Design a protein around this ligand. Structure first.
Ligand SMILES: CCCCCCCCCCCCCCCCCC(=O)OC[C@H](COP(=O)([O-])OCC(O)COP(=O)([O-])OC[C@@H](COC(=O)CCCCCCCCCCCCCCCCC)OC(=O)CCCCCCCCCCCCCCCCC)OC(=O)CCCCCCCCCCCCCCCCC
Ligand SMILES: CCCCCCCCCCCCCCCCCC(=O)OC[C@H](COP(=O)([O-])OCC(O)COP(=O)([O-])OC[C@@H](COC(=O)CCCCCCCCCCCCCCCCC)OC(=O)CCCCCCCCCCCCCCCCC)OC(=O)CCCCCCCCCCCCCCCCC
Ligand SMILES: CCCCCCCCCCCCCCCCCC(=O)OC[C@H](COP(=O)([O-])OCC(O)COP(=O)([O-])OC[C@@H](COC(=O)CCCCCCCCCCCCCCCCC)OC(=O)CCCCCCCCCCCCCCCCC)OC(=O)CCCCCCCCCCCCCCCCC
Ligand SMILES: CCCCCCCCCCCCCCCCCC(=O)OC[C@H](COP(=O)([O-])OCC(O)COP(=O)([O-])OC[C@@H](COC(=O)CCCCCCCCCCCCCCCCC)OC(=O)CCCCCCCCCCCCCCCCC)OC(=O)CCCCCCCCCCCCCCCCC
Ligand SMILES: CCCCCCCCCCCCCCCCCC(=O)OC[C@H](COP(=O)([O-])OCC(O)COP(=O)([O-])OC[C@@H](COC(=O)CCCCCCCCCCCCCCCCC)OC(=O)CCCCCCCCCCCCCCCCC)OC(=O)CCCCCCCCCCCCCCCCC
Ligand SMILES: CCCCCCCCCCCCCCCCCC(=O)OC[C@H](COP(=O)([O-])OCC(O)COP(=O)([O-])OC[C@@H](COC(=O)CCCCCCCCCCCCCCCCC)OC(=O)CCCCCCCCCCCCCCCCC)OC(=O)CCCCCCCCCCCCCCCCC
Ligand SMILES: COCCOCCOCCOc1ccc(C(C)(C)CC(C)(C)C)cc1
Lengths: 54, 65, 62, 54, 319, 51, 48, 56, 486
């Protein structure tokens, strides 16, 4: 009854999405590739595929 | 005269710290022996019943039969 | 077990018993237990016995 | 399919745990709300006793 | 049975002890540099490791790569030998409008290329020589590592009024300007003596835990590995409280530190600091608060009477 | 320094309801099987329901 | 003068091999043979 | 650092013994003892002066 | 082994057991005869949940100031009560059968499990010291630290909730009381009394024919003065009732007793009139005593102690802390509710208080021997037998815990006691080195009990001022001076 507790920043949600995006960025950093030996069959339109470049 | 709040160890003081460490890493050691045993228990297994089976493996626990 | 000051601790404030005249004499009387155990104990007040401190021995002796 | 499966099942396990605990609160732990305010003491170095009177 | 002149001898002994402790504990183990400990940092790079011992590495503008050149993008690891030193070079932040490639001798270099470093022709050699980065070829930066000021504990001041009086005695050899009350001085002396001895016993008690932590650090400095619990036994007072916290079964922590030491409240990295100097015990004498309450309660004629009680005591000692 | 953690499992069990929880769980599950699943499934008179 | 049964350096070197495991070191290393020779792929296909 | 490039160089050599760095340890015990010394010297000078007065 | 060694004297022990039982019966007859006419009725009270009794020393621990008994005879009484407790395994064959003799063998194996009759010594002090040094100090030295941890974790709470439960003013005192085995410095008992700040204000309502009145220092002083004047009862009761009505008016001006506005307690207002019973504006029905004029205010002889222990009360301690408190004090603890262990602890408390009274009658602590004082401190659980202290340190220790037990709070008592049972063991043989300073010595003068001490602010602790440095200390310490110089 009326304890008057200050806000605890550890109970906030301001780090989960940044951390997940950091993990995804670490994943995608390993997709960097050199131009030599590069080939990817695009669609018939000429647009890239989804699974191809990943 | 000796320093206060110090004494020799006794049996009820429990084991030393190195012994507690030796206690802790026993599961970690048995892990290496048990995971292969798990895989062997699954891989070296045979089903117990088939459409043709007239019998099924029975295990009398207390030898009453 | 007899006195309604103690048999009322669950429901009644203790302050209702400290205020003199809050409960009347007949009112205190109806709140007392009337069973045979209460009457046995009421008789046993004036009976000589061998008291012990409230604990495991007083309980074991029953 | 790996990502889909793990994302879905992690969401479901989080739902199970979080909702189980929220319902534990709303169903069983609100009985045990006993807020005691802090009352300052004054008679620290002296206590009235049975011998003070009797 | 302990005269007051024998105290500074004990203080010197304990100073020797704690100095022998701190000269060891002042040392600390730096970061490990064994490549076998960090080989997986390079194994897990986004590109395979280039074992480069022939040809040249050249910077040239971005665009088409010459066929035969091995691109060296940011994140590329390169095992080489530089001035006789086996090394790993990790590419980081290649400049824009430019790219780097390893050109073996079979591969012709393009125009507008700048050879950053090159290798010699040694085909018969079994152990290659590698490179020789001359002064101006490569700017290698050693970390400065500026050793900050050594953390000094504040010495509290002590006003020795009687040293000038001893000097005046040596000059004359009354000496004093006032009439000391020998009873009140022997009172303060006898009380203060026990407070000093009782303080030294507490310091000797604490030095035992420093010369225990230092004996272990001697082993840690020799390269010996100490178990987490073997190391705790050399902190016995903390070993006990830590074992009881385990018996209770509450592995949480952090708010206890924030309540006992409120200067750490809100500080998540409180454990990785040393803020004992920011929070020191005050040098306030509580006796002043006591004597002030004593005078406020008494009247003035009693204050003047005390001058009579003291004067009559002087004449009583005189007669 | 004495601890039931390293010197008495019984006093450790007694002093921790979160050590009683698995035991009560086990007892309750076995009682459930005894009351409900024993005679309806495992008895010889009730074993053909597995067919 | 340690009063406890001091453990040799080599014994600690060997125990570190056992207690320096991480979670993924178990999960994936045991899941690969398991997923391949398990109820999904090989053992399951055979036995079913 | 090179023209158009930046790199990180790591050595490859076994570390046979640990590397030592002198990080001085802050402690209040030496200053405790020095304070004890100073207070005791104050009292010693006091006693010497009082003895000189009482005897001279 | 010890089994056959005790079987050798088991025939010689039954006669002494029965003689001791007779002594116990005679002493209990005397004590109860005095108690049944000089002591008040401490009514039984149930805990907040109202299922088990709760016990406090202020109401239940009575001290017979005027007990015509020697201190050694009371020691015999208490020790023989403990021996009766230790005689309980003799019932095992009479409930299990002839195969219930192996428990009796286990009983006869260890001498610490046994009563006095199996001891070769004669004097109660030497016997008690033998038992302690053989079994009891060792048994106590393995419960002290864990009990201390339980008391700490009772204050600060579980699961990282110290910011919600602990106080920021008892912080430095908490540290000095519970973490002085880190510093090695002595402790001031007043810093343990500061732990009572976790609790509320302890009050005492005297019940009258009209209303309850809160007891104060002024009213108590007046009542003591009237008691000392030795007046006729026609004058005594008149003066008592005058002081009582004065205090009643004073508290009515204060805003009523403290208990009216305390969570968990309260005085009901006038009862309400329901519905048609309401006579217009008079919605209330005052009690019968409202008819009595206030000048007839008389004390009923009934009292209500309200400790207001919101965090210290023995009910909220738990199943484990109570057992460990009884273990540390070498009392029975197994297979009983916390109410029964509460009573056992309160009875131990009463015994210690009566022993303190008899010691003060016998000429204080200095009249005691060295072994007798050692045994007293062992009973108080402030000394362990592996210390070998001085006489002055022992006297100061006795004075400290005696004042602390005068306050009638077991929690702070246990917090004080457990600090003297925090001993470590080194892993090395050379360390700890042989000390250079002499043994710790103190005196009764070094203990500050006659002065109040405010709680030091958090992270701003102040040094300790000796009592001798206070003004007019030679006048206040004159009793201790006369006792020590003689
Ligand atoms: C009319 C119909 C009945 C009405 C309801 C009952 C009325 C009685 C009552 O309880 O009122 C309260 C009344 C209390 O009076 P009070 O003055 O208001 O209270 C004073 C104090 O507060 C008391 O303070 P205290 O703490 O000192 O008192 C001690 C406490 C007692 O001390 C205790 O603390 C023990 C508590 C026992 C708890 C009950 C047992 C529970 C066992 C565990 C249960 C687990 C759950 C199981 C369920 C399944 C779970 C999944 O007293 C009681 O609680 C009274 C208990 C009454 C006895 C009941 C025994 C039941 C045993 C269960 C088996 C019954 C089988 C059937 C019997 C035959 C049927 C005809 O109880 C009594 O006084 C009665 C006691 C005397 C019993 C005599 C019965 C007559 C027997 C005569 C001789 C034999 C028969 C001869 C032939 C007769 C012709 C056929
Ligand atoms: C599964 C159950 C199976 C049962 C099947 C049948 C069982 C038959 C045998 C079982 C016998 C009991 C076992 C039941 C299991 C429960 C055990 C239990 O709860 O007691 C724990 C109980 C825990 O202590 P506590 O409840 O905290 O006691 C607090 C004090 O009363 C502090 O309060 P205080 O201030 O009032 O202190 C008074 C002081 C002294 O009080 C007095 O002197 C007068 C008190 C009035 C008399 C009270 C009657 C006591 C009845 C007990 C038996 C008396 C004989 C004892 C001596 C026999 C051995 C020489 O202490 C005593 O009262 C001690 C009693 C003996 C005093 C001498 C009385 C004269 C004889 C022309 O342990 C005891 O204290 C028992 C002491 C008696 C041991 C005698 C064993 C006799 C073995 C057979 C000999 C052949
Ligand atoms: C099998 C059949 C065998 C038949 C044998 C019959 C003949 C042999 C003996 C004759 C009986 C004589 C009468 C007698 O013994 O009275 C004993 C006893 C004492 O009566 P009393 O002397 O008048 O007590 C007065 C004051 O309490 C005195 O206060 P105090 O300071 O002296 O000590 C008080 C302390 C009692 O002190 C002791 O008696 C010590 C006991 C240890 C010694 C053994 O506390 C109590 O009063 C116990 C009251 C029970 C309610 C309190 C809450 C219990 C919570 C239980 C744990 C949580 C349950 C599971 C939770 C999960 C579900 C939500 O009376 C009883 O109430 C017996 C109840 C025993 C069963 C309790 C089981 C509770 C758990 C049930 C779970 C649900 C299933 C049931 C539906
Ligand atoms: C019910 C409880 C109501 C009253 C509670 C008070 C009480 O019971 O005091 C016990 C009391 C607990 O100690 P304490 O009161 O806390 O005081 C300890 C001292 O401060 C000294 O403390 P300490 O630190 O120096 O330790 C002394 C040491 C040495 O203690 C000794 O004095 C010698 C050891 C005697 C062992 C007697 C137990 C024998 C068990 C049966 C073995 C098989 C018999 C042969 C084959 C059949 O203690 C032990 O090593 C073990 C003591 C506990 C043994 C278990 C006693 C069972 C009590 C029955 C109620 C609990 C079950 C529910 O036990 C004793 O220490 C003396 C032996 C008691 C014999 C009583 C005979 C009646 C047994 C009835 C069996 C009921 C079974 C029902 C479930 C099945
Ligand atoms: C399984 C893990 C181990 C089991 C240990 C449990 C201990 C049992 C016990 O002591 O009961 C009394 C114990 C309370 O006794 P206490 O008054 O606090 O005193 C503690 C003992 O005296 C403390 O024991 P002690 O220091 O006096 O040492 C003597 C004890 C020590 O010996 C033993 O207890 C076991 C002997 C084997 C170990 C020996 C190692 C050396 O042996 C005895 O003579 C008495 C034990 C019977 O009961 C509990 O605390 C409750 C724990 C059990 C309930 C958990 C939930 C049960 C599952 C619920 C199913 C239905 C739910 C729906
Ligand atoms: C065996 C040795 C027997 C000798 C007596 C045991 C030691 C003496 C004792 O326990 O004190 C009695 C105990 C008093 O505890 P306390 O010292 O006052 O501590 C209270 C503190 O505030 C509490 O302080 P604390 O917080 O530190 O300790 C809390 C502790 C307190 O708990 C205890 O008191 C444990 C005490 C150990 C008992 C030993 C059990 C050993 C079992 C093996 C004879 C009875 C005949 C009748 C049986 C049928 C009723 O734990 C609990 O609160 C949980 C208790 C319940 C655990 C089991 C729950 C199972 C849940 C199953 C799921 C149900 C789902 C359905 C839901 C329906 C919809 C709502 O009261 C009783 O248990 C009843 C007294 C009479 C019978 C006692 C013996 C049988 C019942 C137990
Ligand atoms: C534990 O959490 C880590 C899970 O993260 C998984 C992320 O999975 C998505 C990665 O798949 C991609 C997607 C896009 C791409 C590249 C195709 C970024 C786009 C590119 C190279 C053309 C710029 C590479 C990989």
């Amino acid at each position: 009854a009326a304890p008057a507790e200050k806000p605890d920043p550890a109970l906030d949600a301001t780090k989960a999405l940044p951390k997940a995006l950091e993990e995804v960025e670490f994943f995608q950093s390993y997709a960097v590739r050199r131009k030599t030996g590069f080939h990817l069959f695009n669609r018939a339109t000429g647009s890239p595929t989804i699974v191809g470049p990943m | 005269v000796p320093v206060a709040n110090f004494r020799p160890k006794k049996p009820w003081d429990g084991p030393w710290g190195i012994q507690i460490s030796q206690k802790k890493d026993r599961p970690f050691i048995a892990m290496w022996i048990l995971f292969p045993l798990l895989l062997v228990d699954h891989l070296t297994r045979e089903y117990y019943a088939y459409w043709h089976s007239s019998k099924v493996p029975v295990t009398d626990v207390f030898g009453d039969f | 077990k007899i006195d309604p000051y103690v048999t009322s601790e669950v429901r009644v404030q203790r302050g209702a018993w400290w205020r003199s005249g809050y409960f009347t004499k007949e009112e205190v009387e109806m709140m007392t237990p009337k069973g045979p155990i209460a009457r046995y104990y009421k008789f046993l007040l004036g009976v000589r016995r061998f008291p012990l401190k409230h604990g495991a021995l007083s309980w074991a002796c029953g | 399919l790996y990502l889909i499966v793990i994302f879905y099942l992690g969401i479901q396990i989080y739902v199970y745990i979080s909702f189980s605990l929220s319902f534990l609160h709303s169903t069983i732990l609100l009985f045990l709300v006993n807020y005691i305010p802090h009352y300052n003491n004054k008679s620290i170095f002296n206590t009235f006793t049975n011998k003070s009177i009797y | 049975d302990v005269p007051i002149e024998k105290i500074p001898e004990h203080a010197n002994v304990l100073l020797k002890k704690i100095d022998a402790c701190l000269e060891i504990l002042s040392k600390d183990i730096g970061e490990v540099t064994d490549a076998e400990a960090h080989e997986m940092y390079f194994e897990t790079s986004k590109f395979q490791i280039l074992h480069i011992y022939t040809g040249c590495v050249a910077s040239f503008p971005e665009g088409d790569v010459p066929p035969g050149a091995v691109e060296c993008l940011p994140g590329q690891v390169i095992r080489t030998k530089v001035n006789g030193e086996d090394v790993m070079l990790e590419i980081d932040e290649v400049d824009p409008g430019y790219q780097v490639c390893w050109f073996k001798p079979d591969v012709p270099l393009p125009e507008n290329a700048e050879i950053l470093w090159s290798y010699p022709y040694e085909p018969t050699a079994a152990l290659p020589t590698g490179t020789t980065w001359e002064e101006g070829q490569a700017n290698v930066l050693i970390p400065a590592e500026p050793t900050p000021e050594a953390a000094v504990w504040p010495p509290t001041p002590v006003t020795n009024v009687y040293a000038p009086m001893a000097e005046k005695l040596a000059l004359k050899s009354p000496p004093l300007p006032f009439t000391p009350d020998v009873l009140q001085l022997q009172l303060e002396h006898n009380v203060l003596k026990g407070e000093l001895i009782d303080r030294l016993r507490a310091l000797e008690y604490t030095i035992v835990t420093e010369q225990l932590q230092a004996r272990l650090h001697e082993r840690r400095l020799r390269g010996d590995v100490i178990d987490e619990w073997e190391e705790l036994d050399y902190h016995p007072l903390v070993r006990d409280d830590t074992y009881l916290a385990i018996d209770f079964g509450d592995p949480t922590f952090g708010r206890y530190i924030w309540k006992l030491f409120p200067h750490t409240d809100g500080d998540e990295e409180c454990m990785f600091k040393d803020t004992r100097l920011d929070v020191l015990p005050p040098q306030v004498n509580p006796l002043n608060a006591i004597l002030a309450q004593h005078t406020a309660q008494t009247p003035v004629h009693r204050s003047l009477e005390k001058r009579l009680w003291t004067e009559v005591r002087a004449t009583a000692v005189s007669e | 320094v004495y601890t039931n953690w390293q010197s008495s499992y019984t006093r450790l069990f007694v002093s921790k309801p979160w050590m009683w929880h698995p035991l009560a769980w086990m007892t309750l599950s076995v009682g459930i099987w005894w009351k409900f699943g024993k005679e309806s499934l495992c008895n010889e008179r009730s074993f053909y329901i597995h067919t | 003068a340690p009063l406890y049964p001091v453990l040799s350096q080599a014994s600690l070197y060997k125990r570190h091999f056992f207690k320096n495991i991480k979670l993924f070191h178990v999960v994936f290393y045991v899941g690969a043979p398991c997923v391949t020779f398990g109820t999904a792929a090989w053992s399951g296909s055979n036995r079913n | 650092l090179m023209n158009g490039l930046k790199m990180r160089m790591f050595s490859l050599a076994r570390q046979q013994a640990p590397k030592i760095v002198h990080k001085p340890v802050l402690s209040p015990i030496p200053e405790h003892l020095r304070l004890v010394k100073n207070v005791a010297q104050v009292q010693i000078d006091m006693l010497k002066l009082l003895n000189a007065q009482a005897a001279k | 082994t010890a089994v056959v060694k005790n079987l050798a004297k088991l025939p010689a022990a039954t006669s002494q057991i029965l003689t001791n039982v007779s002594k116990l019966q005679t002493f209990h007859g005397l004590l109860e005869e005095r108690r049944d006419k000089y002591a008040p009725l401490a009514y039984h009270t149930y805990d907040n949940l109202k299922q088990k009794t709760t016990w406090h020393p202020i109401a239940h621990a009575w001290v017979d100031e005027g007990l015509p008994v020697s201190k050694k005879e009371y020691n015999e009484y208490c020790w023989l009560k403990k021996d009766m407790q230790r005689l309980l395994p003799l019932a095992s064959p009479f409930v299990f059968g002839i195969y219930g003799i192996l428990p009796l063998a286990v009983w006869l194996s260890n001498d610490g499990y046994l009563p006095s009759a199996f001891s070769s010594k004669k004097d109660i002090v030497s016997k008690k010291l033998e038992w302690y040094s053989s079994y009891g100090d060792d048994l106590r030295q393995q419960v002290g630290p864990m009990l201390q941890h339980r008391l700490k974790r009772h204050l600060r709470g579980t699961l990282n909730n110290e910011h919600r439960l602990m106080l920021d003013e008892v912080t430095e005192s908490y540290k000095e009381i519970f973490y002085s085995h880190y510093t090695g410095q002595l402790r001031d008992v007043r810093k343990c009394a500061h732990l009572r700040l976790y609790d509320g204000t302890s009050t005492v309502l005297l019940l009258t024919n009209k209303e309850p009145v809160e007891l104060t220092s002024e009213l108590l002083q007046k009542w003591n003065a009237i008691k000392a004047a030795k007046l006729s009862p026609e004058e005594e009761k008149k003066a008592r009732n005058e002081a009582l009505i004065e205090a009643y008016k004073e508290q009515e001006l204060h805003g009523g007793p403290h208990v009216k506005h305390m969570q968990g307690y309260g005085i009901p207002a006038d009862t309400p009139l329901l519905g048609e019973n309401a006579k217009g504006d008079q919605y209330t029905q005052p009690p019968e005593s409202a008819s009595i004029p206030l000048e007839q205010l008389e004390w009923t002889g009934d009292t209500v102690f309200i400790p207001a222990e919101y965090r210290t009360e023995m009910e909220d301690w738990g199943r484990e802390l109570t057992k460990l408190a009884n273990q540390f004090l070498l009392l029975p603890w197994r297979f009983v509710s916390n109410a029964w262990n509460q009573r056992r602890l309160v009875s131990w408390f009463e015994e210690i208080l009566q022993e303190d009274a008899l010691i003060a009658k016998e000429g204080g602590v200095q009249a005691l021997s060295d072994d007798e004082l050692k045994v007293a401190l062992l009973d108080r659980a402030v000394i362990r037998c592996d210390e070998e202290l001085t006489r002055g340190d022992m006297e100061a220790r006795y004075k400290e815990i005696s004042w602390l037990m005068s306050l009638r709070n077991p929690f702070i008592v246990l917090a004080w006691q457990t600090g003297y049972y925090r001993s470590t063991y080194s892993p090395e043989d050379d360390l700890p080195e042989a000390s250079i300073l002499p043994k710790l010595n103190r005196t009764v003068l070094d203990v500050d009990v006659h002065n109040e001490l405010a709680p030091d602010h958090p992270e701003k602790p102040l040094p300790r001022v000796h009592p001798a440095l206070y003004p007019n200390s030679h006048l206040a310490l004159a009793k201790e001076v006369a006792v020590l110089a003689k």
